Design a binder for this molecule. Structure first.
Ligand SMILES: Cc1ncc(Cn2c(C)c(CCOP(=O)(O)OP(=O)(O)O)sc2=O)c(N)n1
Ligand SMILES: Cc1ncc(Cn2c(C)c(CCOP(=O)(O)OP(=O)(O)O)sc2=O)c(N)n1
Ligand SMILES: [Mg+2]
Ligand SMILES: [Mg+2]
Lengths: 801, 801
C-alpha cells in the first residue's frame, strides 16, 4: 500500500486534451437531465424508484471516457465493452437523450416499460435489445463477467477468429460492491492471463447503500493492497489539482501523514461539514498542516475536491491504464456520493440548478424540464464531435449476427441416430455430437467447449488431441479450461454465448460440469445470462440423484431441472438415449445459430452411466424436440397403463413395463419424456390461450395429444415435481409420479434407486395400485407385489431421510 | 511475495515435542487403512468412488494437528472447528477406526450408507449427525464458511454469550479450490475483523484434478501475494529438513534464485523422474547449485522432500500461527500429490506398504487387511494419549443443544393477530415479530438479525438504536451488517443457525435480504446449510414479481419459492397478512428451538407493499401452519368457484371474489395459501403412503380437507408452478393457476399485475371461464368480461415477453 495521494504525480500527469469549460457545460446538462428523469418518475407516486446520488459522484469519470476513451462498436470490432454500473443508468439515459438517441417521452417513461416506449431501471439487454449490453445490477457479477470477457476477447485474437486488440473491457464498480466474493474472487486470473485489455474502475465514494464500506478503515487502501498483491496495476485517483501546490508546499511530510492516518468515517464527516471544520479538525491536527491552509479562506479549504471529480486527474489514470501492457489496471477513483446535491446527499432542485449552473430559468424550473443542445450550438457540436472521433455512440447493441452459418444437418448426426454396439451414456453421445460439429467447416472453429478442471470424468480428454487447450496447450488451443471455478467458466460461456451480438461473431459454447454445481451454484449468472440473450449449451454432466451414486449429498442432482425451469429463455432436456441428445443438440444449434436466431440457450442433463442405446424410432424427431413421444405399446389382457420416464430412469420404467406385461398381463404405452418442462410450458400456454379465448375451440397440450386416458405412472431421477409439473395436462384420471425427493447419500445405483423409490419395482407397484383402485385388479395383488419386490412400505419418506 | 523457501528458519523453529518415530508408525497405519478402505470399495465394482492421492499428500499435516493441535469438543467449548477437506475423508475415517470410533464393517461400508452402518463419501452432518460437522466437498464454500465461523465465534465473545477464546477455526483447503471466487473473495474480512482465531491451511501440491493449478506459474507465490496483500500473515512450508544444509552452505544465493525461478510445471516434472534427472535439470542449471549436490548420490538428492511432508516444518508453522494476533494466518504447505504411491500416484499396493514400512505380509496384501494397534501397544497408548491431552476425538457432532429456552407464546405476538391500525406490509410485520422476540428474556440476546447493507429498505434501521450493530454500533452490537455480500451474510447466518450444535449455544438468526439474491445467488450455500442441519430463518424481502415493481428484470422475484422447495429441510411460506407472519415465525421458533429441536430452517418471503391487515380469524392458527385455510365464502346464486391466493396477490383474489359476487352473482370460497409447497409435500406424502398401503385406509391430503369440488382458480406473485404444484391433490375437476412466469420489467404494480395476467381482472375471467365450460354461464359473458376489463387476449405470453 502506497501513501494516500494520487498514484500519478502532477509532474507525470499528461496535458488534458479537451475543452474543460465546454465539457462541464455538457456534463451539467446530463446531470440535470438524469435528475429530472428520476424526479419526474417520482412525481407519479407509483413507487417507481431510481437513483441520483451515485451517478452524481461518478458522472465526471464517465464524462471523460465518453469524450476521450470509449470506442463505440465499429466496422472492425464491437468497440470497448463497458460494464456500466447498473444504478447510474439515469445518467446514461440522460446522455443518450442529449445525443438524441432517446426521446423525451422515453425519459418520461423511465421505469415504465410494459406499454412499449419506456426505459428499464437497469442494463437489461432482454428488455432493451438495441441499447443495453451487460446486466450489471446484481452486484458482483459485473467484475467477474468482465474479467472473462476480457479473457475471451484475447481468446478470439489468439485463435485468429477476430482482431480484438483495439477493444478494452471496462468494469465500472462501486466500492461497496467489491465486498461481494465474486468481485475480487477471480482477480488473479487477470494477472495469470495478462489481461491488459481490462480496466476495473472502482468508484470509491466510501459509502455503500446503508453506510460506509469500512468506516473504521480505509477501503481504498484495502482495495489497493489486495489488487496489488494480485499483481494488478493500481492507480489511485485521490485528490484534485487544488491539492497539488498544498502537497508540494508541505516539506514536513505531515499532510501525507494526516491523509494517511485519517480513516474513512472521518473523511466522510469532514465532507458533511464546512471549511471551518476541516481546517480545524482535519488540517488542525498538526501545526505543520494547519499552517498550510493558515492563509486559506475556509471557502478555499472547502474547495479542495476528491480526485474522482477532477477531469485532469481522471484522464491521467485512464491514459495510463490505456498505455499499460502485461497486466490489468484498476483505477480507484475517490468521489463524493450525492456530490453537489448538498441538501439531498424544489429548494433542492434550485440548489443543483445553481450548483451546476444549469441553463434553466426560474420560470421553467418548476416544470422539471429536460435540457437539450440545439444543432449548431457549441455544446451540441462538441458532444457529437468527440463521439464521432470515437466511432459513434454507446451503449448500443446488435441483437442478431449478420453472417449465415452452414449448420450440420441431422443426417450429419446419423451414427448417433442408430443403435449402438457398445453400451454408452448420454455424455459420450454429447462428446460424439461435438465431434460431428467439429467436422463442420462453418462452425468447427466457432465451437467453445468449456471445462472446470474435470474432463476425464466427462471423457472430454479425447478432444484435447484434436483441438487442444487454450493456454497463451497453446494460444491456439480451442478448449477453455477454467479449473475449479464454476462461476468463471459460466462467465467464459456467457462471453462466448453472446459473442454473436457483442462482436457480431457467433461462437457456440458447450460448458460441461457436474450438474449440481450449475444453477444451484451459479444460478444468478444463469438468470443474468438469459437477460444477456445468451445462446449456448449448458451440459449438466453426472446428473440424476441415483446415477452419480457414490458422491452423495452435495453431488447428487435430483433438482437442477426445477432450478432451470425458472429461467424463461432456457430450454431444458433430460434425454435417456443417444439419438435424443443428437436430435436435441441439432435443434438447439438450428434454433439459436440457424436463420431463426432464437434468443434462447439450452440445458441438457447427461449421464455417467452406460447402457444399451437403441436406434431412433422413425419419425420420432419432432416428438423428441417437443418433449415426449411414445416409445412402444405392450399388449396385455388384464389391463392397460401408460408409463413415462426420462434420463437414466426411463430404462427402469421400461423394465417395469415388461414385468407388468409378463407377470400381470397388464399392457402399457411407454413414453420417453425428453423434457417434462417444455411439455409443462406448452400445456400452460394452451390453457392460457383457452382461458383468453372463451368462444374458441380449446387447444390441446401436446402431451395430451400424445398420451391417452389410461392410468399413468412417471418416474425420473429428479424430485417428483419435475414430472408432476405436467399433471394438469395429462389426459388420464390417474397420474402417479415417482421421484428422488430427499437428500442424496453414497451407495450403489441399485440401492439408491430403491431407497428413492424410483426403480422398476416401484413403478410396477404404482401401476398396479391404480388398476386396483379402478377395480381391474385385487388390492391383494399389489400388497403381494410390495412383498414380492422387497419393498419397505414403512421406511421413512426419502425426503425426510 | 518472498523467496521460495520456508518462512521459518531452523534457528527460529521450535523443538518438535512428539515422538516422531512412534508418530510415523501410527501415521503409516492410517495411510494404509485409508487406502484399504477405498480399494475395498473399488473391488465391489459398484462405481462407489473415493480418492487416495489427495490425502496421501496432506496426511502428515493432519497428523501433526491431531497429535499436537486439534482440541476436541469439551466441557467449555466446541473445541477447534475443523473444516476437513472433503475428499480426504478416507483418511479421517482411517484414523477414527484406529481410535476405535469406527468399526471395520463401517469402513467396509464406505460409500454404502443407505442401509445403516456405512460411511458417507464426504463430510455430511445430515447423514452422519454425530460425526461430521461442516460440509466441504463443494469447493469454495468451506473457506468462506470458515471465515464467517471465526467471525461468529468472536461475535459470541464480544456479546458476552460465550468465551470462544480457546477455539481456533481451521479451514483445510486445496490450491486448486482457491480458484473458486468464494475461496479468496472474502479473505479481506479476516483482516477487517482481525480474525486471529482463523487459520487457512492450503494444500499446495501444485495440482487440481486434471492437471497443475498453474503450470506456467507458481500458485504458492500467487497465493502468498494476494493473501499478504489482503493483510493476512502467510507462512510458507516449502522444503523438508534435508534442504537446510544445502541452503545454509549456499553462500552464492543461487539455490534460492533457482527455486524462485522454477515454475510449477517443472517442479512437478521433477517428482515423476529420479535423482539423476533432478541433478541435471534442477541443480544442473547453475555451477554453484550443481556444486552443492556434487558430493551427493542421486539417491540422496532424490530424497530431498517438500516441507509439507516434514513434521518439524509443519509443527513450526502451526505453532507460529498460534501466537499470531490481529489477523488471520494462511499456511502454504508444499506437498506431493499421490505421495509415496509412486508409480500409481491387490499386490501393486505392496509398494506403498514397502514405502511406509507397513506391517502386513506379501501373502496378506491381496486380502487388503486393516491395521489396528492393540490396547497396550506403544502406538495405541500414544495415539489416545495425544488426543486425551487435546480433550478427546474429532470430528464429532452433537445433534441437539442441551439448554431449555423459554420461547415466546403465540399470545406474546397478540398485537400482530389483531387488525392493524395503519396499512403495513408483511416486512413491517416481520420486524414487529422480531421485537416481540427481543423482549423475551430467554432468547432476546440469542437472536441474530443479519442484513446485507440494505436495512432501511426493510425498516430495520429502527432496531439499530435499539440493539445496535456489531462492530468489534459497538462490539456488543447485536445486528450483523455484512454489506453487499449475500454469501458472507448467509455464512454468518449458517454459523449462527448451527451454533446450537457446534457450541451447544442456540442462536436464532434472522437474515433478511432482497429475495432474488437468496437461493438464486447462494443456493449452493443453502443446500449445504440443510446438510449442516441449520436452524434459522431466511427472510426474502421485497419478494414477488409484481411487488418490487420498479426494480425490474434482475430484482423481481417470482420463483425463489421454486428454488427453495428443492431443499428437503427448508420450510417455505408466502404469507399475505401480518398475523400469518406472526403465527409462522412463532411456529418456526417452537419447532426449531423448542423441545422439538426439529432439524429444519425457515424461508418466509415478505413484501414491501402496504395494505389493510385484517385480524386473524379465530382458530386459523393451525391452518396457517399447515398451508391453507378458508378466509371466507361469499354467496352467489349464479355459480360457485374457489379462489386461492398467497402473498401480495391474495388481496387481488379477494377483490376478484367481490366482483364475481357483485357483477356476476357468482359465489365463492376464498382461501389464503400460506405455503403451497408444504401442502404439496403433504399431498405427496399422502399418496406415497397410500400407494404403499393399498389395503389400508387412504390418507387425505390436508388441502383436500380444506377445499371442495367447485371449479378453482389460484393466483400468486410467483410463476404458475408455485400454485400448480398441488394440482394432483386439489379435489376439484378444474383448477386454473395464474402466475408471474416471465422476466420482470419496470412499471407500476398495477401495470405489472396486468402484464403478468395475475390481477383481479384475470382471476374473474379465469373463474367465469370455468363456469361457461360447465354450461353454467354463457361464453359471451366471459368474452365481455375480457372486453370490460381491458384484457388483451392476444398479447404475447409474459413468459415469452
Ligand atoms: C447482488 C445485489 N445485492 C444488493 C443490491 C442492492 N443495491 C445496493 C446494495 C447498492 C449499493 C451500491 O453501493 P456501491 O458502493 O457498490 O456503489 P455506489 O456507492 O457508487 O452506488 S445499489 C443496489 O441496487 C444489488 N443490486 N445486487
Ligand atoms: C464446487 C466443486 N467443483 C468441483 C468439484 C470436483 N472436485 C475437484 C475439481 C477436485 C480437485 C481438488 O483439487 P485441490 O487442489 O483443491 O485439492 P487436492 O489437490 O488436495 O486434491 S476434488 C473434487 O471433488 C467439487 N467437489 N466441488
Ligand atoms: Mg460506494
Ligand atoms: Mg492441489
Amino acid at each position: 500500500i502506497s501513501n494516500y495521494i494520487n498514484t500519478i504525480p502532477v509532474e507525470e500527469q499528461p496535458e488534458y486534451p479537451g475543452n474543460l469549460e465546454l465539457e462541464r457545460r455538457i456534463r451539467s446538462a446530463i446531470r440535470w437531465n438524469a435528475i429530472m428523469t428520476v424526479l419526474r418518475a417520482s412525481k407519479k407516486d407509483l413507487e417507481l424508484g431510481g437513483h441520483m446520488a451515485s451517478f452524481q459522484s461518478s458522472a465526471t469519470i464517465y464524462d471523460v471516457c465518453f469524450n476521450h476513451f470509449f470506442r463505440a462498436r465499429n466496422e472492425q470490432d464491437g468497440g470497448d465493452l463497458v460494464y456500466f454500473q447498473g444504478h447510474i443508468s439515469p445518467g446514461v439515459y440522460a446522455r443518450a437523450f442529449l445525443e438524441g438517441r432517446l426521446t423525451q417521452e422515453q425519459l418520461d417513461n423511465f421505469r415504465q416499460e410494459v406499454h412499449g416506449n419506456g426505459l428499464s431501471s437497469y442494463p437489461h439487454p432482454k428488455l432493451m435489445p438495441e441499447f443495453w449490453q451487460f446486466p450489471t445490477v446484481s452486484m458482483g457479477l459485473g467484475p467477474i463477467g468482465a474479467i472473462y470477457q476480457a479473457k475471451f476477447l484475447k481468446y478470439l485474437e489468439h485463435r485468429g477468429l477476430k482482431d480484438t486488440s483495439k477493444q478494452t473491457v471496462y468494469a465500472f464498480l462501486g466500492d461497496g460492491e467489491m465486498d461481494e466474493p465474486e468481485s475480487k474472487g477471480a482477480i488473479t486470473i487477470a494477472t495469470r492471463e495478462k489481461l491488459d485489455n481490462l480496466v476495473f474502475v472502482i468508484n470509491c465514494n466510501l459509502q455503500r447503500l446503508d453506510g460506509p464500506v469500512t468506516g473504521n478503515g480505509k477501503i481504498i487502501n484495502e482495495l489497493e493492497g489486495i489488487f496489488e498483491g494480485a499483481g494488478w496495476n493500481v492507480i489511485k485517483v485521490m485528490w484534485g489539482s487544488r491539492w497539488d501546490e498544498l502537497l508540494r508546499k508541505d516539506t514536513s511530510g505531515k499532510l501525507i501523514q494526516l491523509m494517511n492516518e485519517t480513516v474513512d468515517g472521518d473523511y466522510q464527516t469532514f465532507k458533511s461539514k464546512d471549511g471551518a471544520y476541516v481546517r480545524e479538525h482535519f488540517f488542525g491536527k498538526y501545526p505543520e498542516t494547519a499552517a498550510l491552509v493558515a492563509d486559506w479562506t475556509d471557502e478555499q479549504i472547502w474547495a479542495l475536491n476528491r480526485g474522482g471529480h477532477d477531469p485532469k486527474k481522471i484522464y491521467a489514470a485512464f491514459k495510463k491504464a490505456q498505455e499499460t501492457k502485461g497486466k490489468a489496471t484498476v483505477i480507484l477513483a475517490h468521489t463524493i456520493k450525492g456530490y453537489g446535491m448538498g441538501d439531498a446527499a424544489m429548494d433542492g432542485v434550485r440548489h443543483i440548478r445553481d450548483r451546476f449552473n444549469v441553463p434553466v430559468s426560474d420560470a421553467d424550473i418548476e416544470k422539471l424540464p429536460y435540457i437539450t443542445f440545439p444543432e449548431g450550438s457549441e455544446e451540441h457540436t462538441y458532444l457529437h464531435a468527440q463521439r464521432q472521433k470515437l466511432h459513434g455512440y454507446l451503449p448500443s447493441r446488435q441483437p442478431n449476427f449478420t453472417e449465415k452459418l452452414e449448420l450440420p444437418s441431422l443426417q450429419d448426426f446419423g451414427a448417433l441416430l442408430e443403435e449402438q454396439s457398445k453400451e454408452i451414456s448420454t455424455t459420450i453421445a454429447f462428446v460424439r455430437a461435438l465431434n460431428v460439429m467439429l467436422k463442420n467447416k462453418s462452425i468447427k472453429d466457432r465451437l467453445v467447449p468449456i471445462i472446470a478442471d474435470e474432463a476425464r470424468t466427462f471423457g472430454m480428454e479425447g478432444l484435447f488431441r484434436q483441438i487442444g487447450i487454450y493456454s497463451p496447450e497453446d494460444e491456439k488451443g480451442q478448449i477453455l479450461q477454467e479449473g475449479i471455478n464454476e462461476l468463471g467458466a459460466g462467465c467464459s460461456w456467457l462471453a462466448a454465448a453472446t459473442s454473436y451480438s457483442t462482436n457480431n461473431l457467433p461462437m457456440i459454447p458447450f460448458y460441461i460440469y457436474y450438474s449440481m454445481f450449475g444453477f444451484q451454484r451459479i444460478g444468478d449468472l444463469c438468470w443474468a445470462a438469459g437477460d444477456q440473450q445468451a445462446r449456448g449449451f449448458l451440459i449438466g454432466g453426472t446428473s440424476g440423484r441415483t446415477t452419480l451414486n457414490g458422491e452423495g449429498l452435495q453431488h447428487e442432482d435430483g433438482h437442477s431441472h426445477i432450478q432451470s425451469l425458472t429461467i424463461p429463455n432456457c430450454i431444458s432436456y433430460d434425454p435417456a438415449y443417444a439419438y435424443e441428445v443428437a436430435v436435441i443438440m441439432h435443434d438447439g444449434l438450428e434454433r439459436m445459430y440457424g436463420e431463426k436466431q432464437e434468443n434462447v440457450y439450452y440445458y441438457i442433463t447427461t449421464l455417467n452411466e452406460n447402457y444399451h442405446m437403441p436406434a431412433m424410432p422413425e419419425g420420432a424427431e419432432e416428438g423428441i424436440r417437443k418433449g415426449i413421444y411414445k416409445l412402444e405399446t405392450i399388449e396385455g389382457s388384464k389391463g392397460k397403463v401408460q408409463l413415462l420416464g426420462s434420463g437414466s430412469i426411463l430404462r427402469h420404467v421400461r423394465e417395469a413395463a415388461e414385468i407388468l406385461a409378463k407377470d400381470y398381463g397388464v399392457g402399457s404405452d411407454v413414453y420417453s419424456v425428453t423434457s417434462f418442462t417444455e411439455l409443462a410450458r406448452d400445456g400452460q400456454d394452451c390453457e392460457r390461450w383457452n382461458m383468453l379465448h372463451p368462444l374458441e375451440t380449446p387447444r390441446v397440450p401436446y402431451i395430451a395429444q400424445v398420451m391417452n386416458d389410461a392410468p399413468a405412472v412417471a418416474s425420473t431421477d429428479y424430485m417428483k415435481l419435475f414430472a408432476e409439473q405436467v399433471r394438469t395436462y395429462v389426459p388420464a384420471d390417474d397420474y402417479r409420479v415417482l421421484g428422488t425427493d430427499g437428500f442424496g447419500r453414497s451407495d450403489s445405483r441399485e440401492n439408491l434407486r430403491h431407497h428413492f423409490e424410483v426403480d422398476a419395482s416401484y413403478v410396477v407397484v404404482a401401476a398396479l395400485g391404480e388398476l386396483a383402485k379402478r377395480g381391474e385388479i385385487d388390492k391383494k395383488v399389489v400388497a403381494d407385489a410390495i412383498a414380492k419386490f422387497n419393498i419397505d412400505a414403512d421406511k421413512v419418506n426419502p425426503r425426510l431421510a
